[PDB]
Amino acid sequence: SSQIRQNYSTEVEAAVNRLVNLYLRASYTYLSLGFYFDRDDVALEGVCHFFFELAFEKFEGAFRLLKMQNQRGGRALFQDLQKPSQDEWGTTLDAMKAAIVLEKSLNQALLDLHALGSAQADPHLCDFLESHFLDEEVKLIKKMGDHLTNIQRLVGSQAGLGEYLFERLTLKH
Amino acid sequence: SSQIRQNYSTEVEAAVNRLVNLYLRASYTYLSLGFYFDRDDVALEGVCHFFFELAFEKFEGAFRLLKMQNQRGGRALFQDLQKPSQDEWGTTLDAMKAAIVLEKSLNQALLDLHALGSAQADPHLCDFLESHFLDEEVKLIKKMGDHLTNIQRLVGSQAGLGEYLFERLTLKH
Amino acid sequence: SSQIRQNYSTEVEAAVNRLVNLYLRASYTYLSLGFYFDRDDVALEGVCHFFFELAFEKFEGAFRLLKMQNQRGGRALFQDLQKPSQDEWGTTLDAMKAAIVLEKSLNQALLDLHALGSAQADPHLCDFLESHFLDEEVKLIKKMGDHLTNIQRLVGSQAGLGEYLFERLTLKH
Amino acid sequence: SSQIRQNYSTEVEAAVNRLVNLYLRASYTYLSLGFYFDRDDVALEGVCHFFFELAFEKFEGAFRLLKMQNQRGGRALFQDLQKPSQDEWGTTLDAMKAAIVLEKSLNQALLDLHALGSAQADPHLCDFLESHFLDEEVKLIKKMGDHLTNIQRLVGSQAGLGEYLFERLTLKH
Amino acid sequence: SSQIRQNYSTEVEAAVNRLVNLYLRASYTYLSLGFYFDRDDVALEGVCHFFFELAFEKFEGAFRLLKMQNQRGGRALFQDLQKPSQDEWGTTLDAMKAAIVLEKSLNQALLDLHALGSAQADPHLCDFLESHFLDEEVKLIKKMGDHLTNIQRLVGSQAGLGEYLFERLTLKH
Amino acid sequence: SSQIRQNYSTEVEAAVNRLVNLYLRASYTYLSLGFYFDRDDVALEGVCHFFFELAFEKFEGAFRLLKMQNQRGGRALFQDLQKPSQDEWGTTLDAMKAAIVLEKSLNQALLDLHALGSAQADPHLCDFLESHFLDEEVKLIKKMGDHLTNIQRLVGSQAGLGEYLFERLTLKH
Ligand SMILES: CCN(CC)c1ccc2nc3c4ccccc4c(=O)cc-3oc2c1
Ligand SMILES: CCN(CC)c1ccc2nc3c4ccccc4c(=O)cc-3oc2c1
Ligand SMILES: CCN(CC)c1ccc2nc3c4ccccc4c(=O)cc-3oc2c1
Ligand SMILES: [Cl-]
Ligand SMILES: [Cl-]
Ligand SMILES: [Cl-]
Ligand SMILES: [Cl-]
Ligand SMILES: [Cl-]
Ligand SMILES: [Cl-]
């Protein structure tokens, strides 16, 4: 087989392909989230833009993973992309809760892959994840947690008002 | 009669004149809406500016229609302009509801005229409507629907607060 | 009623609303004049542009009047807008004669309103009219009189030639 | 045959080739018109330039049609180009009358082709015509009608004077 | 249901959702094509970049469709995304053949949707497709056909040489 | 007849008209050549652009001839334009061979006309041809001969490869 492959296990190759699938699924989920908040009967522009930026971020993550797979001499293999878990995403709070669950699952998949790289003595893979993924994910989950807290603080007894204010004064538009 | 007229039915000519009347009536309605929200006892600058921009837009629509009537060799005929349906327009919500009703009526008149053009095999008219009117109208009705949803979300139990916040944080001033 | 209204009679309020109606009717008349001279079988661009500029001027006059009505704490009330007095406007001479008749009627309405303001000891209204309307109107009627004289001088025995030359060499295109 | 052709009827292909022939014939007619008005014994520069600009416009129309034929996977087929209908074109009025007749024939050919596209459910062809041809033609015929009216107004009893003035004060030089 | 929806059939809404699925599948196919040509054992940079640009184009198409669905008051519904039809894509010729098959299928889906819009008297949908999709697709299929012809001309008896030269001298890098 | 004509024979006048016909026929031939190489199943952009530039050059030649005819007081007379000699033009080699045959025929017509001018003692005509036509033609035929030699050198046993390389590395795109 490969004229470049070196120190790159079949286990890591497969796991990288699985992780691509997870990132692309996450991108799709965020595309659905974005268009839901674009509905005339939802109409929260800042929320919309927040989730579309994440759709792009997750697609970029997948792309970098696929680039690395080729740089290492593995073979990119694509699978079916499962549709997102919901067709409607409820409130901004419901959506941000679903997004943090999603991110925590991606982070766990990154950690799992890092551990596999470590067991396989694959330092390039370990560094790749550390340099492009693990801190980005920590930073994103922190920001989502910050948002959750602010959204929650605003529910009070006037939920609509709080939802509008969060979109207007925290999220970008 | 006309040295330029070609493929331009009397039915379309008349319907174009009727549509001009509808656009000018819509412009007038929006002028009334704008000055109501300019009242010292209403005083919602952003709402005022939103409806004045629409008064100008609807006048522009009428002007383009009249330009096209002449380009086709039809004869512009003006009728009495009915005053707007109300002298006072209630809340921002009441006003935005009235505006979307108005826009839906204009859109239906555009669709009706497009259908007439299609039946008469008048592709220039059909393209004119598609290129300058139908998508502008879809975009406007979408924006009004977005606004309605945000206004509605803000009523809650503190209607005045919500009305102020919508004007301050969504509409332009 | 009004928390701002001071020294502003019901008579002036009503007369201001009537004057708005007159200005908007004048704007409409000028819109009709403009599109007539835009006809392929009339085709006098300079005349067209002259009357469209007046349509805009008269609309601006109405707008300023409505702004002032609100600044004084009166209530803008709109009525039906009568269509213009003609559907076709004849020669440039016929049109300019009709325009000066129209302007003289507006000027008389301004003078009448000024007199009412004076009788009611309403100096703000009197100054408003003097500052934004009376001299603009004198200047416009003078310019129309100048035009009439030039158009008349050009009729001679070659009316078409004179009509073309006036449009080409006096009016803007 | 063609590796790209899709939804593109033989009838439309042939009609497009015929329309190319019509446009190129129109270009040739305008070339003849231009050089006639360039004669020392005619010498109307503005008229000359007006018809040369149209020769170029009609050639561009043909070129776009031929580009589209290839984009659709049809085969451009050229036929003999009939010489223009006259060798001398009379007055500016005679020439502008001949030009509007010509344009009306081109417009009818466009409408005929649009109808064929519609019957064949060929929306690309229908849009192509609407986007690049039908409104350009309406605008041109309107401008020619405007010119005819001005030329006619200037004949009066001093035809030479009127012909000179039209060329000098309306047409570009 | 919807406060904005007007003249927008359930049939069109569903078909738009189906078309989104087709565009996203096409984007995925092009992502796979791109990474295959990025393999160290394939290594055709220009081919890689050509297919990645198409992945982005097809994603943009899907996005515009979803935007329009919301502008019309339809509801975006996502389905599972089928993986691409192949894991390895053979030669540049094999790949470009597969890409033109794919594009022809998308074009047929656009035409089908346009026909449905026409039957339903939905001119906004018909114009949307004409303005953003049908000509882009014709232009792309023409370019692919051009490429196919050039690739085919280069096979001769030295296929590797021809594949290299096409990538180096036609495709962008 | 003519108030400007001087030293300008009927024989030269007629021959100039014939030469215009030849130039316009040549322009048409080059238009056909250009669109053939624009076909999806030919697809040689550089060849396409080479022949379109010549279509424009030959049209310019005709235009200059017609300008000169009027400057001399002759009368431009147009005839039917024969369609080009072929509907399909074969290889780049076949096309360039046909183009040099065409150019040699134009050059001979120029030389013939120069000789007629010389016999008629018409130095203005002789200079006009020398200054705007004879050297342009020599330069063009030299360039075509250069191209023929390069195309011929590239046929070898891999004709497609050679045809691609010539288009890519010699002709402009
Ligand atoms: C409202 C019924 N009527 C009287 C028939 C209106 C309404 C609105 C108008 N708005 C404009 C306008 C708006 C923006 C920029 C330029 C212009 C203009 O030149 C003339 C106008 O004339 C109007 C007449
Ligand atoms: C009149 C019948 N024939 C010969 C078939 C014409 C007529 C007009 C033409 N006008 C152009 C032209 C005009 C403006 C800018 C570029 C071009 C050009 O590149 C080629 C032309 O070729 C023409 C051929
Ligand atoms: C391939 C299947 N999936 C997951 C559903 C894709 C494919 C391609 C995509 N391309 C973009 C994209 C491309 C250019 C510029 C911006 C963006 C963007 O913001 C989001 C994207 O998201 C994508 C998802
Ligand atoms: Cl599968
Ligand atoms: Cl009446
Ligand atoms: Cl009433
Ligand atoms: Cl023949
Ligand atoms: Cl499912
Ligand atoms: Cl003949």
Author numbering:
A (entry chain A), B (entry chain A), C (entry chain A), D (entry chain A), E (entry chain A), F (entry chain A): 1 to 173
What does the paper say about this structure?
The resulting mutants were named Fr‐F2 (Fr‐E56F/R59F), Fr‐F4 (Fr‐R52F/E56F/R59F/E63F), and Fr‐F6 (Fr‐E53F/E56F/E57F/R59F/E60F/E63F), where i in Fr‐Fi represents the number of newly introduced Phe residues per ferritin monomer (upper). Within the vicinity of pocket F59, an intricate network of aromatic interactions is established, comprising three phenylalanine (Phe) residues (F52, F56, and F63) in Fr‐F4 and five Phe residues (F53, F56, F57, F60, and F63) in Fr‐F6. Analysis of the 2Fo‐Fc maps revealed electron densities corresponding to Nile Red (NR) at the two‐fold symmetric interfaces of NR•Fr‐F1, NR•Fr‐F2, NR•Fr‐F4, and NR•Fr‐F6, observed as overlapping densities due to the interface symmetry. NR was positioned between two F59 residues, forming π–π stacking interactions in an F59–NR–F59' configuration. In NR•Fr‐F4, a change in the χ1 angle of F56 was noted among the four introduced Phe residues, but no significant orientation changes were observed for the other Phe residues (F52, F59, F63). The quantum yield of Nile Red (NR) significantly increased from 0.50 in 100% methanol (MeOH) and 0.38 in a 50% MeOH‐water mixture to 0.88–0.95 upon encapsulation within Fr‐F1, Fr‐F2, Fr‐F4, and Fr‐F6. Furthermore, NR's fluorescence lifetime extended from 2.87 ns in organic solvent and 1.26 ns in aqueous‐organic mixture to 5.23–5.75 ns within these ferritin variants.
